[PDB]
Each structure stands twice: as C-alpha cells, then as structure tokens.
Design an enzyme around this catalytic site. Structure first.
Site, PDB file in Angstrom:
ATOM      1  N   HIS A  31      22.977  28.492 -58.372  1.00 20.75           N
ATOM      2  CA  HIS A  31      23.226  28.557 -56.858  1.00 20.75           C
ATOM      3  C   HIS A  31      24.348  27.693 -56.347  1.00 20.75           C
ATOM      4  O   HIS A  31      24.624  28.002 -55.151  1.00 20.75           O
ATOM      5  CB  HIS A  31      22.063  28.474 -56.165  1.00 20.75           C
ATOM      6  CG  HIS A  31      21.516  27.115 -55.994  1.00 20.75           C
ATOM      7  ND1 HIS A  31      20.674  26.273 -56.710  1.00 20.75           N
ATOM      8  CD2 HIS A  31      22.036  26.293 -55.173  1.00 20.75           C
ATOM      9  CE1 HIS A  31      20.805  25.103 -56.308  1.00 20.75           C
ATOM     10  NE2 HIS A  31      21.243  25.039 -55.328  1.00 20.75           N
ATOM     11  N   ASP A  64      18.221  29.386 -62.919  1.00 19.74           N
ATOM     12  CA  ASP A  64      18.947  28.765 -62.210  1.00 19.74           C
ATOM     13  C   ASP A  64      20.001  27.945 -62.774  1.00 19.74           C
ATOM     14  O   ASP A  64      20.081  26.676 -62.726  1.00 19.74           O
ATOM     15  CB  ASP A  64      18.634  28.241 -60.763  1.00 19.74           C
ATOM     16  CG  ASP A  64      19.579  27.728 -59.759  1.00 19.74           C
ATOM     17  OD1 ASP A  64      20.650  28.159 -59.921  1.00 19.74           O
ATOM     18  OD2 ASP A  64      19.141  27.041 -59.059  1.00 19.74           O
ATOM     19  N   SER A 114      21.666  19.669 -55.270  1.00 22.00           N
ATOM     20  CA  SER A 114      21.826  20.913 -56.042  1.00 22.00           C
ATOM     21  C   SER A 114      22.570  20.807 -57.387  1.00 22.00           C
ATOM     22  O   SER A 114      23.548  20.102 -57.325  1.00 22.00           O
ATOM     23  CB  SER A 114      22.304  21.963 -55.193  1.00 22.00           C
ATOM     24  OG  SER A 114      21.484  22.379 -54.312  1.00 22.00           O
TER      25      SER A 114
HETATM   26  N1  O5Z Z   1      14.937  26.232 -49.302  1.00 19.84           N
HETATM   27  C1  O5Z Z   1      15.314  27.090 -50.380  1.00 19.84           C
HETATM   28  C2  O5Z Z   1      14.228  28.011 -50.939  1.00 19.84           C
HETATM   29  C3  O5Z Z   1      14.375  29.045 -51.695  1.00 19.84           C
HETATM   30  C4  O5Z Z   1      13.907  29.175 -53.288  1.00 19.84           C
HETATM   31  C5  O5Z Z   1      14.355  30.091 -53.825  1.00 19.84           C
HETATM   32  C6  O5Z Z   1      15.228  31.300 -53.408  1.00 19.84           C
HETATM   33  C7  O5Z Z   1      15.511  31.210 -52.213  1.00 19.84           C
HETATM   34  C8  O5Z Z   1      15.056  30.144 -51.443  1.00 19.84           C
HETATM   35  C9  O5Z Z   1      16.057  26.369 -51.222  1.00 19.84           C
HETATM   36  O1  O5Z Z   1      15.667  25.410 -51.835  1.00 19.84           O
HETATM   37  N2  O5Z Z   1      17.383  26.822 -51.492  1.00 19.84           N
HETATM   38  C10 O5Z Z   1      18.185  27.814 -51.096  1.00 19.84           C
HETATM   39  C11 O5Z Z   1      19.084  28.150 -51.900  1.00 19.84           C
HETATM   40  C12 O5Z Z   1      19.728  26.888 -52.407  1.00 19.84           C
HETATM   41  C13 O5Z Z   1      18.245  26.158 -52.642  1.00 19.84           C
HETATM   42  C14 O5Z Z   1      18.466  24.604 -52.651  1.00 19.84           C
HETATM   43  O2  O5Z Z   1      18.539  24.397 -51.137  1.00 19.84           O
HETATM   44  N3  O5Z Z   1      18.284  23.825 -53.363  1.00 19.84           N
HETATM   45  C15 O5Z Z   1      18.442  22.364 -53.071  1.00 19.84           C
HETATM   46  C16 O5Z Z   1      17.123  21.584 -53.251  1.00 19.84           C
HETATM   47  C17 O5Z Z   1      16.307  20.859 -52.643  1.00 19.84           C
HETATM   48  C18 O5Z Z   1      15.512  20.332 -53.132  1.00 19.84           C
HETATM   49  C19 O5Z Z   1      15.479  20.526 -54.426  1.00 19.84           C
HETATM   50 BR1  O5Z Z   1      14.669  20.402 -56.245  1.00 19.84          BR
HETATM   51  O3  O5Z Z   1      16.728  21.459 -54.579  1.00 19.84           O
END
Ligand code: O5Z
Ligand code: NA
Ligand code: NA
Lengths: 250, 11, 28
Positions: free
Chosen positions: A43, A99, A198
């Site tokens: 991602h 991912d 990330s």
């Molecule tokens: N809030 C959404 C939820 C979501 C989960 C699965 C699919 C779609 C949305 C999210 O986490 N993200 C959106 C795409 C990227 C990713 C993200 O910000 N990661 C970074 C991060 C934070 C903590 C940690 Br551990 O990782």
C-alpha cells in the site's frame, strides 16, 4: 510512532526510508533484507482509493538514516530503484490482505555501522516467536499522534495479541496473512504505529541465536494508539514463498 | 520541511 | 546473508540496546 522513544544510533540498521523525488517528502518505511533488496508494504506503492500508484522513477530509498529531515552526509546512502514487485494477490479493494512488496535496487548498497540487513524468519523461528504476549519492535518516522512529527527515528516495543482479540477489535475481515499487536486497555502501557510508519518492520530478537528477524510489516490500523484498537502487520513468514520466488527469478 | 538531497540522486 | 540480523554497533560488539531486554523477558 505513538508513545515510542528516540532510537539509539545504529539500533535499526535495516530501516529504510521511502522518499518521493518531487515533491521531496517521506512516503513510507521499509527494510533492508540484502545488499540489493528492500521489503515494504504494497500500500506504500499502490493504493487506488487514494490515487496512489508509484513507478520506480518516482522514488528513492534512503538507508542508514536517523534524522527524519536532515541529509545525513557520510552516513546515509541514497539508492534508485530498478524494479518494484507487488504481491499478485495483494487485496487493496477490501482489507489489505497480502500487503507486501519488494524493491530491487539499481546497485548494491555498501554495508556499514549504520546499514545492515535484517533476517527473514524460517518456519521454526516463526512458530516459536509468533505467540500472544511475545513482544516485537516497530520503528519509523511517522506521526507522533493521530491528530506532530519526530526529529529522529522512533521505536516502540509491542506485544503480539491473541487472534480472537484482534478479530473482536474491528469490523474489517482479518486473514491468516496478518497478525495484530499492541497493549490492551487494562495493561496501562501504550504505543502504536501511525501514518508514515507504513511499510516499516516489526522485528523480534531470537533468544535461540541472538539475531533480529523481521516478522511483520506495518500494514493497517483504525486510528493510532486508540484504546481497544490494535495495529495490524503483514505476516512475513506466511508470504515468504512469494519473496523467495521473486528473488530467485529476478 | 526536508533538507535538499544532492542533485546527483535526482538525475 | 550470513550475518543478517547482527547489528554492527550492538550484537557484533556484544553491546545491548536500552530496551531489548523487554523483548527477551516476554519470550516466556
Ligand atoms: N485506516 C485504514 C483502515 C483500512 C484497512 C484495510 C483496508 C482499508 C482500510 C488503514 O489503516 N489504511 C488505509 C490504507 C493504508 C492503511 C494505513 O493507513 N496504514 C498505516 C497504519 C497505521 C497503523 C498501522 Br499498523 O498501519
Ligand atoms: Na470483528
Ligand atoms: Na490500542
């Protein structure tokens, strides 16, 4: 990283910063797994809901860093990318299943006191260490709070959480290619990854051979450091057959 | 916000 | 690699970092 601390010099010599060429900015974390290969979250490179789809020439990797914003002359090394490989079954539509992505560098990086690869787990190390309550370490230059940004690399140690607790914390569908980590509300201590962390590594130090292994990749969470929420990590061992196939073929 | 990196890496 | 996971400024010199013991104590 929320509720972490400043890293020591050389504490995470496999930590990689993914850097956008123009505008110049941090994109993600990543990890060094050999002199030519960097591991990250898919991602970080491909996420259509946010109009994200980077190509090799858009990006650089910065290795050996400590300061977030400084150009660390004579310490960090900056590499161009030869090729990006994203898992073919990476599920960006639903829940970020699988991912994971690899980046091959244009030229090998020289190791140093500040630049050194992490190990990937074998089946036995994964089985022995991926247990509820066992702690790993997450590192990155991402935000210090959900709602600001650190001067130097941050580090936090977090316990792996029982799978039923992970599942009951969210409405998102969890898979065997993920694990979750973080403290429970009644545990007192806190800490989490956040935006900008990330793709960075969740590492554990094997008590059998005293080497550091990358068990996870910072993948997703709902907020940062919220009570009753946990961070979710790509399960590196479960995807290692794909990693090996890519590195062998390319 | 970030210190400029050497031009050689941007060529 | 042969020396993966062994940090030049820590394991290679038999120095510990300030919080790795917290990890070890959890491996119960
Ligand atoms: N809030 C959404 C939820 C979501 C989960 C699965 C699919 C779609 C949305 C999210 O986490 N993200 C959106 C795409 C990227 C990713 C993200 O910000 N990661 C970074 C991060 C934070 C903590 C940690 Br551990 O990782
Ligand atoms: Na649920
Ligand atoms: Na939490």
């Amino acid at each position: 990283i929320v509720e972490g601390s400043d890293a020591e010099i050389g504490m995470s010599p496999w930590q990689v910063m993914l850097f956008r060429k123009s505008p110049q900015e941090l994109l993600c974390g990543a990890s060094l797994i050999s002199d030519r290969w960097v591991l990250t979250a898919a991602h970080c490179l491909l996420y259509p809901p946010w109009d994200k789809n980077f190509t090799e020439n858009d990006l650089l990797v910065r290795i050996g860093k400590h300061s977030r914003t400084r150009y660390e002359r004579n310490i960090e090394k900056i590499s161009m990318l030869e090729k990006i490989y994203i898992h073919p079954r990476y599920n960006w539509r639903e829940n970020l299943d699988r991912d994971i992505a690899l980046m091959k560098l244009k030229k090998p990086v020289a190791f140093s006191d500040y630049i050194h690869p992490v190990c990937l787990p074998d089946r036995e190390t994964a089985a022995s260490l991926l247990q509820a309550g066992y702690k790993g370490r997450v590192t990155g230059w991402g935000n210090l709070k959900e709602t600001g940004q650190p001067s130097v690399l941050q580090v936090v140690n977090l316990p792996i959480v029982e799978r039923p607790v992970c599942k009951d914390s969210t409405r998102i569908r969890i898979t065997d290619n993920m694990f979750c980590a973080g403290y429970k509300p009644d545990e007192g201590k806190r800490g989490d990854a956040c935006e900008g962390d990330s793709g960075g590594p969740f590492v554990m130090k094997s008590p059998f051979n005293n080497r550091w292994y990358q068990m996870g990749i910072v993948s997703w969470g709902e907020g940062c450091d919220r009570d009753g929420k946990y961070g979710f990590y790509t399960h590196v061992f479960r995807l290692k057959k794909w990693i090996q196939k890519v590195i062998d073929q390319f | 916000d970030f210190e400029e990196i050497p031009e050689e890496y941007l060529q | 690699e042969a020396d993966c996971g062994l940090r030049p400024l820590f394991e290679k010199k038999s120095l510990e970092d300030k919080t790795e013991r917290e990890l070890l104590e959890s491996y119960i």
